[PDB]
UniProtKB/Swiss-Prot annotation, chain C:
The PsaA/B heterodimer binds the P700 chlorophyll special pair and subsequent electron acceptors. PSI consists of a core antenna complex that captures photons, and an electron transfer chain that converts photonic excitation into a charge separation. The eukaryotic PSI reaction center is composed of at least 11 subunits. Coiled coil: none annotated. It comes from Arabidopsis thaliana. The chain crosses the membrane at residues 2-28, 50-72. It comes from the Eukaryota. This is Photosystem I P700 chlorophyll a apoprotein A2.
From Swiss-Prot, chain D:
It comes from Arabidopsis thaliana. The keyword Membrane applies. Belongs to the PsaD family. Interacts with CURT1C. One of its GO terms (biological process) is photosynthesis. Keywords: Chloroplast, Membrane, Phosphoprotein, Photosynthesis, Photosystem I, Plastid, Thylakoid, Transit peptide. This is Photosystem I reaction center subunit II-2, chloroplastic.
Swiss-Prot record, chain E:
Its cofactor is [4Fe-4S] cluster. It is an enzyme of class 1 (oxidoreductase). The keyword Ribonucleoprotein does not apply. Keywords: 4Fe-4S, Chloroplast, Electron transport, Iron, Iron-sulfur, Membrane, Metal-binding, Oxidoreductase, Photosynthesis, Photosystem I, Plastid, Repeat, Thylakoid, Transport. This is Photosystem I iron-sulfur center. The eukaryotic PSI reaction center is composed of at least 11 subunits.
UniProtKB/Swiss-Prot annotation, chain G:
Chlorophyll a binds at M675, Y683. It catalyses: reduced [plastocyanin] + hnu + oxidized [2Fe-2S]-[ferredoxin] = oxidized [plastocyanin] + reduced [2Fe-2S]-[ferredoxin]. Disulfide bonds: none annotated. GO terms for molecular function: 4 iron, 4 sulfur cluster binding; chlorophyll binding; electron transfer activity; magnesium ion binding; mRNA binding; oxidoreductase activity. Keywords: 4Fe-4S, Chlorophyll, Chloroplast, Chromophore, Electron transport, Iron, Iron-sulfur, Magnesium, Membrane, Metal-binding, Oxidoreductase, Photosynthesis, Photosystem I, Plastid, Thylakoid, Transmembrane, Transmembrane helix, Transport. One of its GO terms (cellular component) is thylakoid. This is Photosystem I P700 chlorophyll a apoprotein A1. GO terms for biological process: photosynthesis. It comes from Arabidopsis thaliana. It is a multi-pass membrane protein.
Amino acid sequence: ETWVQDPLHVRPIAHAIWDPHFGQPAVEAFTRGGALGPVNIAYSGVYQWWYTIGLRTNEDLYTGALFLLFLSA
Amino acid sequence: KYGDKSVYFDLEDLGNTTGQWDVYGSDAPSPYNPLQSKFFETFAAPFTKRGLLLKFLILGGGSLLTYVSANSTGDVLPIKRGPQEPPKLGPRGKL
Amino acid sequence: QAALYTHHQYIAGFIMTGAFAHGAIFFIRDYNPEQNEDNVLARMLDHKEAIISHLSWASLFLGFHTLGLYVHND
Amino acid sequence: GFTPPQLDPNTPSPIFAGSTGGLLRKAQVEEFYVITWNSPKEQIFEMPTGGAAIMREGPNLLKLARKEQCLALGTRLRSKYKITYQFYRVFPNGEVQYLHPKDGVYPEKANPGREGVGLNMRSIGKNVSPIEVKFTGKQSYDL
Amino acid sequence: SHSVKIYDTCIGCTQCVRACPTDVLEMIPWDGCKAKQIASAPRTEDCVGCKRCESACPTDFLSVRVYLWHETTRSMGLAY
Amino acid sequence: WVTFYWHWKHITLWQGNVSQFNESSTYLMGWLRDYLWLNSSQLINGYNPFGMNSLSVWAWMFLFGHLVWATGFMFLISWRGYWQELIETLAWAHERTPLANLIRWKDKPVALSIVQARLVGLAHFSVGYIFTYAAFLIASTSGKFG
Amino acid sequence: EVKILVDRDPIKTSFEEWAKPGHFSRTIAKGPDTTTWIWNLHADAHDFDSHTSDLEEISRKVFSAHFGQLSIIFLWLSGMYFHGARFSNYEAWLSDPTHIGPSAQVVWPIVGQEILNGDVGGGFRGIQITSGFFQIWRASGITSELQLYCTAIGALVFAALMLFAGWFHYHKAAPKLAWFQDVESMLNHHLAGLLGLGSLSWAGHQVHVSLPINQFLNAGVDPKEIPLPHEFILNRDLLAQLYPSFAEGATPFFTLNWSKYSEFLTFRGGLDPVTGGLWLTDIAHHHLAIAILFLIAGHMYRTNWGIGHGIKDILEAHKGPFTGQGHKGLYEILTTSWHAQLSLNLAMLGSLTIIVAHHMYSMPPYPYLATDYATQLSLFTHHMWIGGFLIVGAAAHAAIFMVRDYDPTNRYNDLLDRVLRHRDAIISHLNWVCIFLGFHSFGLYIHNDTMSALGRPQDMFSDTAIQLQPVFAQWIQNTHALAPGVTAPGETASTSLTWGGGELVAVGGKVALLPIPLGTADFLVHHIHAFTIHVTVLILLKGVLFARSSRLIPDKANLGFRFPCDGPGRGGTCQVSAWDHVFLGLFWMYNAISVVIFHFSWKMQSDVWGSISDQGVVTHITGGNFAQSSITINGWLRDFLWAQASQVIQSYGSSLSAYGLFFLGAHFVWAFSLMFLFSGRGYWQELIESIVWAHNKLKVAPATQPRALSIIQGRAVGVTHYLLGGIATTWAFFLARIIAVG
Amino acid sequence: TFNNLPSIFVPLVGLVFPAIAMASLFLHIQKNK
Ligand code: CLA
Ligand code: CLA
Ligand code: CLA
Ligand code: CLA
Ligand code: CLA
Ligand code: CLA
Ligand SMILES: CC1=C(/C=C/C(C)=C/C=C/C(C)=C/C=C/C=C(C)/C=C/C=C(C)/C=C/C2=C(C)CCCC2(C)C)C(C)(C)CCC1
Ligand SMILES: CC1=C(C/C=C(\C)CCC[C@H](C)CCC[C@H](C)CCCC(C)C)C(=O)c2ccccc2C1=O
Ligand code: SF4
Ligand code: SF4
Ligand code: SF4
């Protein structure tokens, strides 16, 4: 939802990270994209391709994920 | 006969031939005290069914692991403490 | 834009190696030389030495020359 | 029904100070391939388990690890020392299967009394392709 | 275990079996050659797959032929 | 080769200095210096003896891929027989080591089959190729974003 | 007992066998049905144990082959001394050796390669050599180029003499087997007569020629002003003006009044602070004492007279309680087998080359060696590599003994049998300790790498986080620094200044071997070295022991020493041969010596070498980044490999450009080797048969049938290209790095 | 709780699911009928 507004200057986020081996410097360094915790930057472009086909909210992605789970079942 | 002069193929006693030996397996009786032995027997007979032991081990260990990692705060693991630091703006603005 | 290109090209290289490997597995397991005698596929296996030799030529030519040029420039 | 097995008795074993290439737990649950030979003199030979052994004048007996060990030993015996040998297979239950000549004659002299198996009466190119035997237990070479 | 096969191109030179270190092979009489003998493979259970037999078969391609197949403890050549 | 060409042409375009590629891509020491040695500057410094940054994961993955890419050379260069003999010694030791004689395997241990170990060497080799170049590409294009 | 048993005209000098290639072998002396024949013509060329069965002809062949090798080395030294004489700046390097690059090779201006002739210094354009011949020549008191040309001519003469000697001792009058087997006289002579008298004669040179000349060269004298060496022999007043003990001559010697010889035979251990090398005064006394020692040691073995130890009487005397008969039989398996002796001498000569590498950096014996960081690094690295190779060849030839020359019937040994009988125990414990060391030496690097990547530098194994200090090595270091005193009086200083209590030998702007501090990184890398050595010994010892038999192949000796396999059976039995074990041990020796010379280069450039200004502040080449960055692999990749490879790759258009060229080329040859190590023969034979169809289509079918390389040959080509490529990569990288920043 | 769910699922997955999976698969390997 933040990437949609300023995409050129807001970093994508693949998923958060909970690695209990992390030290506090690593918790501090991996906090990107305006997150309250560590994160990994989506170098997959899924942000761009979802934003180009609609999908301008997190609820849109939630509905899509639930529907794809239904499709997997 | 296995004990003859350089005979090691007693076909009847195939254990001595193939090397089936308790090399250190002393058959000496229980050196423990009887009372503490009975104590351990009665207090560890719950762990006699290997299948129930395995189910208990896996489920209780996973439960304790989730409990530790969910109730532990950031003082014992920095990943739950969080950033406690402002985020650096990446290259080229942030992209 | 780099991760996607690199991704799909390594994927394409693997998929291509697998395409050929499954053609080989076909030529062993599923190829009946009597049911396709003297056909495009059978006439193909005939001049396998010609194909292999001319592909060898192309690779040998390219590697020789282009490595020579890179080395000349080095 | 022309050559009976020999049923190795409690013969002496070669003089050997013991090695680590000997009989492991394979003998304790599977076969271990005893070999028997008959020496003219007390001579010294290389053991297939590594190390040097001193064979005894007269019959000997060695329980080494497996078939290739005793057959390599017996080939070295027959070639270097010119000595008749025969080896066995001793399952842990107790049975003793006779194996090396299985006819009293080594398996080079084509002596009649042995049935030919593993015998495809064709040249090696005339085997069918796998597609002709697809979805069948016979792979390529048992028709 | 392994499937050793002897084809009818064999000249009966007795190298396949004099090279075989596990008594898999044995020469038998035959009427297809000047030597009047051919190799057979009864004891394929003792076959390790070392292909010393077919590294000594002097024919166009081969007459003896070893096919790698279900590997057991004795075809894998294990003392343990 | 394809992706090295791509990444260098594009990182030079994005940085602005197409002349770097157009002058240095014609001789291999340009690729070894101006592409690999130069763009790996911000990566291997992902975690120095004094602190780390966001590219620590990419440096660790870089070295991880180097490691498996080297481990594949084990299964490729070394083949089956040295390892079977080594495992025979190991089996002797385990069956004659006290307090571990009580423990006996159920599957008789053997060195990996030749075709298997080939496959395993290629798996390590390709995993290392891929993870190494992913680390390098991602870290170089993310350390700067041109 | 001992004699000169030698037979005349055994072999005819004729080109008739040159015309018939492969004459030495039976299968090779009938024609090339295939191309593999030529590979077998070179492979078996020096396999004299396979050509013949009698040891007499083999001994003659190898004796004359050693003469050819000595001819080659005399010709090589001829080249070095000559190139120093004519194509060098040695006459100028003596003036300012701390700033002029030693150069002895010039290239021809043809294709732009004249850039290699660079500004070494001395008004001379050439290649900055890293051999240390200039340092020797300053230690030999040359002070000219005429002496070098005369030395080259004399070396060419001795090369021709050795060539004639090989011809004479094979074709004209060849010794028979009773002559070589008299090892008692051979040791008595090579100890006393080669090593004793050789060190004595070099002590004579060191006393008469090197010492008086270096007394002037170090005392600001120009080489043109120095008196010639023979003027010290002819005129003793000039020699006595610096060392008055020569005025008394040998009367101090023969009267045992040696106390009045200390002007030139010293014990003041340490480095000459005017040039950084050891005191030549100490080296003269050294080689003298070594002469005495080898001279009394070469009168140990009975040769013809009633005195002396018969080596059989020494070996048979040692018979262990539960070790059996003991060393009985060894005199008969060492004197009736060249391969056993070759293995023993190779192992010791290789470890000795390594000890040379280790003692030539920490006790620089030549002037201006420690300050020529290129020479120091290159010499250490060289001799380390030679030692690893010689040890690996010792393994190969132990295996060849065990396959061919080992006979428990006739030439029996007890201890070798006992080793063969628990070989599984040896290899099991070695295979364990290799894994233990691997873990607790390299997994520590992995732990440090992960902890530094997780932002946990307080959890590494560093000199700051978790102490793994070399307490034992630190104790030896501190007690060797405080060794001058109660334990070793009359030395005036430590025998080396690589210990913490030592001092800095400032030579010019350079530093020249101040103390070496041992920290956690040294612990980690030394256990890495123990690890790599132990794995190499695992592989090689395993090949040697299982050369004859295993549980897998019990008839491996009948298959030979050098065979690929025994088929895909038994799950696959590739590389069961001892040849393949040593082929793998080559790679592991490579990894070992590579990390060794990396440790050397980095520890030196960070903690030893550098530049010390006149104020006393020493700045090292890297900046002391070893103990902090050599705890994790990313430091070796970043601060050693990536950083120090900024002078070999940036050297394009410079004088050091062949170094970057061979950097890339050795990279290539290594990778090319991977085509051989990874692939197999069958693919290449099928491809060759396809392109042979393409040739037969054009009537270009060669009669020497194109065959893909044999399997063992593919492995040989792979390991040699792999080693050559990795080693030339490292050579170029080191030399450019260390010549550029110097 | 959403910030506490990785702390429950990552130790769950990456340690227990190996326990369950590798144990059950070793039992499936070492089986006889
Ligand atoms: C840097 C490493 C490297 C190099 C140089 C090669 C080179 C080659 N491979 Mg590949 N290969 C490699 C790694 C490499 N491979 C690896 C790691 C594997 C995995 C096992 C393979 C697997 C493989 C297969 C499976 C096949 C090849 C093929 C080929 C040939 C392709 C034809 C070509 O371009 O040749 C042009 C020539 C060269 C590249 C050689 C370069 C050297 C120069 C030109 C020689 C001259 C220099 C000098 C004057 C000689 C003297 C040197 C010294 C004695 C003084 C060629 C020889 C194919 C083939 O044979 O097709 C014909 C083929 O089928 N290779
Ligand atoms: C020049 C005169 C001469 C002549 C005509 C012969 C003739 C002969 N010699 Mg004798 N020999 C000579 C000199 C000579 N020798 C010398 C000087 C030595 C001492 C090294 C020997 C030592 C010697 C031994 C030990 C043996 C012979 C043998 C032979 C016979 C076969 C040699 C053959 O075909 O290989 C021809 C080989 C070559 C032409 C090349 C050999 C390599 C040379 C010596 C050195 C190479 C240096 C080179 C620079 C290094 C490579 C690096 C390069 C890549 C840069 C033949 C009767 C053999 C024999 O009779 O046994 C049956 C035998 O065993 N010779
Ligand atoms: C590939 C083989 C090879 C090559 C090319 C070189 C090349 C070089 N060596 Mg090395 N070396 C080698 C093998 C090799 N070495 C081995 C195997 C040994 C172990 C004996 C040595 C021991 C050695 C020493 C000790 C020194 C060199 C030096 C040198 C350099 C000057 C050459 C010279 O002759 O100066 C003249 C040679 C000397 C001054 C050496 C003195 C003689 C030694 C101490 C002993 C005598 C040998 C003995 C008779 C045989 C061994 C006896 C046995 C009991 C072990 C040059 C870089 C010298 C150097 O780096 O100078 C800067 C130097 O000091 N090397
Ligand atoms: C004192 C030293 C010494 C001596 C006398 C010998 C002598 C011998 N060795 Mg041993 N060996 C040595 C050192 C030594 N080796 C070392 C240091 C190693 C470690 C690698 C080995 C490893 C080794 C193995 C593994 C084998 C031998 C074998 C042999 C025998 C035959 C070799 C032959 O005919 O090849 C003649 C010469 C050649 C074929 C040329 C080799 C080509 C080299 C690799 C070229 C590349 C190296 C070069 C420096 C790089 C420059 C490249 C440039 C040209 C472009 C012979 C008895 C063989 C044997 O006994 O077989 C039964 C055998 O299998 N050796
Ligand atoms: C980097 C590449 C690499 C690595 C890691 C290894 C690893 C090993 N080699 Mg191999 N080898 C390689 C390349 C490599 N080799 C190549 C290229 C060759 C070609 C010649 C060989 C040839 C070769 C031979 C011929 C021999 C070895 C031996 C060894 C062993 C010694 C170290 C050991 O066990 O200690 C512990 C393990 C290591 C140091 C490896 C790194 C592992 C780290 C420290 C920890 C791993 C993580 C941990 C277990 C957590 C697991 C997590 C879970 C998710 C899985 C080990 C299996 C020797 C052997 O088997 O006997 C000991 C032996 O004889 N190797
Ligand atoms: C000791 C080293 C170590 C270890 C153990 C971990 C562990 C972990 N890290 Mg990592 N990490 C490390 C060092 C380490 N980290 C370092 C040094 C860095 C750089 C600073 C990072 C950076 C990092 C990031 C950026 C992220 C992690 C994440 C994770 C978690 C992944 C979740 C999981 O269960 O994966 C499960 C395992 C896999 C997915 C591996 C799949 C491949 C396997 C091997 C094949 C499976 C075989 C078969 C198909 C299935 C059969 C069953 C099988 C169990 C046998 C996990 C807790 C992620 C996280 O927190 O999300 C939850 C994440 O985003 N880490
Ligand atoms: C210019 C252009 C054009 C045209 C083009 C073209 C015409 C192209 C072509 C192209 C091509 C032409 C391509 C190709 C490709 C191929 C491939 C990629 C192949 C592969 C193969 C394989 C993989 C194989 C497999 C197998 C085998 C091995 C055998 C058996 C069988 C099989 C088949 C299975 C147009 C105008 C339109 C448009 C624009 C552009
Ligand atoms: C490439 C390769 C081959 C084939 C290598 C060939 C046979 C070498 C190529 C031919 C050489 C270069 C000889 C041709 C040069 C001749 C001297 C002819 C001269 C012609 C002019 C150049 C003068 C193998 O046989 C092999 C075997 C086992 C494992 C890996 C491999 C392997 O990787
Ligand atoms: S080796 Fe071949 S040709 Fe000779 S006997 Fe055996 S099967 Fe017949
Ligand atoms: S593969 Fe080996 S064991 Fe089998 S038949 Fe051939 S030689 Fe005998
Ligand atoms: S792969 Fe090569 S080395 Fe291994 S068994 Fe087969 S032929 Fe022998």
